[PDB]
Structure 1
Amino acid sequence: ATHKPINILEAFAAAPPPLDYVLPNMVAGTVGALVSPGGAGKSMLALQLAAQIAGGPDLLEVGELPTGPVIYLPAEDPPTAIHHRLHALGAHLSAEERQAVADGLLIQPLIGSLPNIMAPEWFDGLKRAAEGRRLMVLDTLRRFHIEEENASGPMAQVIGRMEAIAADTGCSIVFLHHAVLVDNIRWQSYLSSMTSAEAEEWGVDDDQRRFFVRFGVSKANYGAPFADRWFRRHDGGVLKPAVLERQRKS
């Protein structure tokens, strides 16, 4: 929110200091987006990412990430659904990993709460909930505001508010979005369920395509290129790397 001018001479003289990535190619202290059609698994993947930064294992094999307290704000799923996802995830975690996640990760369900980042008391409240956290996840942005998502003005105000919170507190904010916003943000990732055409090409049967999703970073400023991943959906929806041959057509 308020900054001193850069000390230029000091930025030239001080050693090349590594960018700090909250998520692959996302600079810590900023706002990013996870984008996909409803149902593709954003809520699972975000949960897994949240748990990982909280100190659980890199199950997705996206690479090791700095740890810190995390706050997950699901506003669309009822608590009981969150319990199920957690329990399913839990089967993949050791006793110590589980404990680290429980220490590091706050999940504060907001279904029916009607949170509105443009109202001063919700702004304050989201800002207080970001304080002391390294990551905040909004699942999904649509439930945190009552603006027209296709209006760039109101959306600059909505995103600007998240930017102010991330800038002041150092808590990165990632919002999920059901598939503009994209132009208003600097880091963008996505999920897409395996299509009929992608199925007939990584050599998986059509009746099995529902078990795989592509994950990538479609927008970022900085870092080494991030290769698109395939994930297999295990029980409860838990995502892990998929082992896929790929079809060099004759």
Structure 2
Amino acid sequence: ATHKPINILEAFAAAPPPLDYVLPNMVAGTVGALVSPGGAGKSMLALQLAAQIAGGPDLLEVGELPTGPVIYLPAEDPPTAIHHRLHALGAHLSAEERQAVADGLLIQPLIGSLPNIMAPEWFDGLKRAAEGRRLMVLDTLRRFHIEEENASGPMAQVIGRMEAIAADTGCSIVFLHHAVLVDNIRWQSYLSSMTSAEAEEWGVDDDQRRFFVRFGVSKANYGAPFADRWFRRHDGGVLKPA
């Protein structure tokens, strides 16, 4: 991506428009990450977040978010598991809310598709898929490159390419990661399954500790502090404040 030099005098003179946030504390046009131990329901959280930005309700009750076309790229779930998740989520959506989501959200399954962002054709296809879109969700990043996630040089290139896409197209990119990467990224959120100790601080009890997860923004550089939230795993995995 390229940029005009900043016009100092203008910035001084005109009070700027509020910062455009695609997600809590995440500036639109940048790259962010959603981290979690493979088993907390990152995919469901991302689907709901994507459904919201595409037009849907704020079921998760995180701030109200601006709306825009969203593209979700699940590379680790079979199409049928996606259908079931959507059907479940839908039970919480009105006829209007469902049509909104269907209107703004495109889900392109990629399981076994072998996307490689460092390869020409995939870089080009992802860039094009990002054009005119507000958010692009990669689930999970492990499936979009063949590099060692512990090597800072290769990862700088892989994250660089996503930044190049987000900056050029204006489409924000959020990748999911199975818990380096966190040190590169400027916005990072997490999801973690409730623990013993935690099941003994607000209430509840074990055997039931698996119907709850905590979400929160672990790292950001702008905006008011986002308060860690608790979510109850309803049927099919759908998440709600609770």
What range is the shorter-chain TM-score in? over 0.9
Shift of 1:197: 1.0
Shift of 1:200: 1.6
Shift of 1:113: 0.3
Aligned to 1:104: 104
Aligned to 1:245: none
Tell me the secondary structure at the aligned position of residue 76 of structure 2.
coil
Which whole-Å CA distance do the structure 1 matches of 2:202 and 2:14 have between them?
48
Tell me the secondary structure at the aligned position of residue 121 of structure 2.
helix
Tell me the secondary structure at the aligned position of residue 201 of structure 2.
helix
Which whole-Å CA distance do the structure 2 matches of 1:12 and 1:141 have between them?
39
Deviations 1:55-95 (A, max 9, x none): 00000000110000000000000000000000000000000
Deviations 1:73-132 (A, max 9, x none): 000000000000000000000000000000100000000000000001100000011011
Deviations 1:149-199 (A, max 9, x none): 000000000000000000000000000000010011000000000001100
Which whole-Å CA distance do the structure 1 matches of 2:13 and 2:239 have between them?
44
TM-score calculated relative to the size of structure 1: 0.96
Deviations 1:23-51 (A, max 9, x none): 00000000000000001110000000000
Tell me the secondary structure at the aligned position of residue 198 of structure 1.
helix
Shift of 1:205: 1.1
Aligned to 1:60: 60
Work out the number of aligned pairs and report it: 242
Tell me the secondary structure at the aligned position of residue 126 of structure 1.
helix
Which whole-Å CA distance do the structure 2 matches of 1:175 and 1:201 have between them?
31
Which whole-Å CA distance do the structure 1 matches of 2:194 and 2:188 have between them?
19
Deviations 1:125-145 (A, max 9, x none): 000110111000000000000
Shift of 1:241: 0.5
CA RMSD of aligned residues (A): 0.5
1:1-250 alignment, distance < 5 Å: 1-242=1-242
Which whole-Å CA distance do the structure 1 matches of 2:2 and 2:177 have between them?
28
Unaligned runs of 5+ in 2: none
Shift of 1:16: 3.5
Which whole-Å CA distance do the structure 2 matches of 1:236 and 1:202 have between them?
24
Deviates more, 1:12-21 or 1:82-91: 12-21
Shift of 1:18: 0.3
Tell me the secondary structure at the aligned position of residue 47 of structure 1.
helix
Moved over 6 A (4+): none
Shift of 1:15: 1.1
Which whole-Å CA distance do the structure 1 matches of 2:230 and 2:5 have between them?
43
Which whole-Å CA distance do the structure 2 matches of 1:141 and 1:196 have between them?
30
TM-score calculated relative to the size of structure 2: 0.99
Percent of aligned positions that are identical:
100
Which whole-Å CA distance do the structure 2 matches of 1:202 and 1:41 have between them?
21
Tell me the secondary structure at the aligned position of residue 148 of structure 1.
coil
Which whole-Å CA distance do the structure 1 matches of 2:25 and 2:65 have between them?
11
